[PDB]
Structure 1
């Protein structure tokens, strides 16, 4: 049943066939600038367009090196390396590495999964080449940027019941690592997702160099000069859902929010957020994950976070996105620090909205003096100072169960009401809220 091919050129015709079982032979395959052109291997982007359905593709022991210059060979258009348009396909075990750091002419995605019921399993992906690289999103991640960007994201999950499984995604690029747009029932399972960090102090130390940030006097898109004391990811979201997007299934173009996402047993390291699903609709479920050194741990809006952990070294482990947030059920372990604390947010959690049931567990005994569990109040988040992003800060919390099985202090702001707080220690619970209940329990 298995057709084996021994070159990228012989591979490409099968991508237009339904019901094929193909194996690309073990080996190293290189895509460079000379391979893009009208009589060259790749005349169009996406480079690898899986239009067929009901197919399987075996890339075991395949090292695919794509020179980032390919990102500039298709004019001012988005460049996708891999896109799946058909249904019921299985791609497995490919090792795919971006070579060099050349920025896209426009923007790039390594993998776009449209269609329905597809699965990508066992991939090892390394993402490079973007602009600017060094500032995270401080100078713009969308329209109206202070420094114009050429983003390069990793895996874009769209379509229906599409599945990312047992993948390793390393990004050294300014973009999302794994993200979901218009995806219905996407599942990310068993993946290791990793970016890298840089302090805002190191950014501000470009003063006087003529860097792009230096030439705008570090004025961020948030309305104020980049503040010292924060650790930022050079990437965007580790796993981030969007409330918009376009996808294609069965020849139908679809525009809709992501809905019913599921994330299971993922480890997320050094991204802007660990798991953020607050902007998807439907049922959100997160179980068994580990978030290390992200600016933000878990933000799913509503739904279930269970058997999950995050450290607090660079930002809070938990944050309610808006005052609308309702029904956020979470059980989160605050993990031992994976590096030295550098958390300018002055919070381990920011809680608001209503009708939440929240449990925090930890073995940490060394509590940094600036870290507390906040219910309502004015979070000192990098992106929400001085009225920036106003719906994402300074909001009320009501009818919340807070089980603080940790040593972290709790600060109940005056906009909090009907918070039912159980804690290891009550002496470090300040309550300026209304009709809040504080009871002690035995460690």
Structure 2
């Protein structure tokens, strides 16, 4: 009942068919610039457009090598290597690697998942080729950039009930590793997600070289010269819900926020954010995850984070995004450091909003002197200095349960009120808020 094909040329017709069971024979397949043309195999982008429904595609032992020059062969248009438009499709075990580091002419997304009830399982994806690469988002991630960009993202989850399962996503590109736009009930489960880091001091050492950052005198889009002392990711989000977007389901174009995301048992390493879902609506659930060396650990806005862990070497494990945050319930383990501490944010957590139930657990005995649990106050975060992103800093906290089962100190700012604090040690808790309760525990 399974059709096996032995070339990308013979694969493509099946992508336009419904109810097919297709296997691409074990082997290596190469997509290079010569392969993209009007009379060539890849006439249009997306390269692999899964338009059919109710189909299964097996890519076991398939290595698909896509030369990044392909990202420049479609004019000034977005290039997507893989897009699923149908429903009830299963794609499994493909190994996809972006070859070379050539930047996209405009922008690129390796995999885009529209439709409903699709699953991508067991993929191994390596993302390469973007501009600028080496600065993170310091000189622009959207419009009005200090340095113009050609972003390359990895997996874009849209549609309805679409599922990313047991995948490895390695990024060496300036883009989100895994993100959700206009997605209803997306689920990310069992995935390993990894980017790479670079200190702002290393960036600043480009002074005099004529680098692109050197030529703008390191003036960031946040309004100030790039500060030393921070560790940045070269990628954007690890698992992120975008603000708003467009998806396609059953020939219906839909503009909406992401809603009801679920993230289960994922390890995220060296991204801008471990798991950030504050922009998603509906029920948010994050369970069993590990976040290592990210600039921020967990920021889902509201919902549940349970049985999760983050280390604190490069940024806070937990951040309330806005003062409008409400009903954030979290049980987070501060993991032992995966590398030396280089956390310029001067906080292991920033807590604000109202009606939160927060538990922090750790075995760490050696606490860096700048690391503190903050309830309200002026976070020294890289992107919120000197009034930048003002809704994400300097906001009040009210009616919050804080169970500090850690040796980390707690600072309650004067904008904090009705904070119920239990801690291993209350001697390192400073309270300048209103009607805060502070009880020690064994």
CA-to-aligned-CA distance 1:169-201 (integer Å, 9 cap, x gap): 000000000000000000000000000000000
CA-to-aligned-CA distance 1:227-267 (integer Å, 9 cap, x gap): 00000000000000012000000000000000000000000
Q: How far, CA to CA, are the matches of 1:163 and 1:79 in structure 2?
A: 22
Shift of 1:341: 0.1
Q: How far, CA to CA, are the matches of 1:133 and 1:212 in structure 2?
A: 11
Q: How far, CA to CA, are the matches of 1:205 and 1:145 in structure 2?
A: 22
How many matched pairs? 442
Secondary structure of 1:70's aligned partner: helix
CA-to-aligned-CA distance 1:305-325 (integer Å, 9 cap, x gap): 000000000000000000000
Secondary structure of 2:202's aligned partner: helix
Secondary structure of 2:273's aligned partner: coil
Task: Give 5+ residue unaligned stretches, structure 2.
Answer: none
Secondary structure of 1:313's aligned partner: coil
Q: How far, CA to CA, are the matches of 1:314 and 1:244 in structure 2?
A: 28
Shift of 1:371: 0.1
Secondary structure of 1:214's aligned partner: helix
- Superposition TM-score, scaled by structure 1 size: 1.00
CA-to-aligned-CA distance 1:397-441 (integer Å, 9 cap, x gap): 000000000000000000000000000000000000000000000
Residue number in structure 1 paired with 2:49: 49
Q: How far, CA to CA, are the matches of 2:157 and 2:406 in structure 1?
A: 36
Shift of 1:63: 0.1
CA-to-aligned-CA distance 1:84-122 (integer Å, 9 cap, x gap): 000000000000000000000000000000000000000
Residue number in structure 1 paired with 2:378: 378
CA-to-aligned-CA distance 1:363-392 (integer Å, 9 cap, x gap): 000000000000000000000000000000
Q: How far, CA to CA, are the matches of 2:239 and 2:212 in structure 1?
A: 28
Q: How far, CA to CA, are the matches of 1:137 and 1:302 in structure 2?
A: 25
Residue number in structure 2 paired with 1:157: 157
CA-to-aligned-CA distance 1:319-355 (integer Å, 9 cap, x gap): 0000000000000000000000000000000000000
Secondary structure of 1:37's aligned partner: coil
Secondary structure of 1:46's aligned partner: coil
RMSD between aligned residues:
0.2
CA-to-aligned-CA distance 1:246-290 (integer Å, 9 cap, x gap): 000000000000000000000000000000000000000000000
Q: How far, CA to CA, are the matches of 1:303 and 1:410 in structure 2?
A: 23
Secondary structure of 1:282's aligned partner: coil
CA-to-aligned-CA distance 1:140-162 (integer Å, 9 cap, x gap): 00000000000000000000000
Shift of 1:11: 0.2
Q: How far, CA to CA, are the matches of 1:418 and 1:244 in structure 2?
A: 34
Q: How far, CA to CA, are the matches of 1:265 and 1:16 in structure 2?
A: 34
Q: How far, CA to CA, are the matches of 1:344 and 1:231 in structure 2?
A: 7
Secondary structure of 2:430's aligned partner: strand
Residue number in structure 1 paired with 2:300: 300
Q: How far, CA to CA, are the matches of 1:254 and 1:180 in structure 2?
A: 14
Residues 12-411 of structure 1: matches in 2 within 5 Å? 12-411=12-411
Q: How far, CA to CA, are the matches of 2:243 and 2:134 in structure 1?
A: 27
Q: How far, CA to CA, are the matches of 2:111 and 2:389 in structure 1?
A: 30
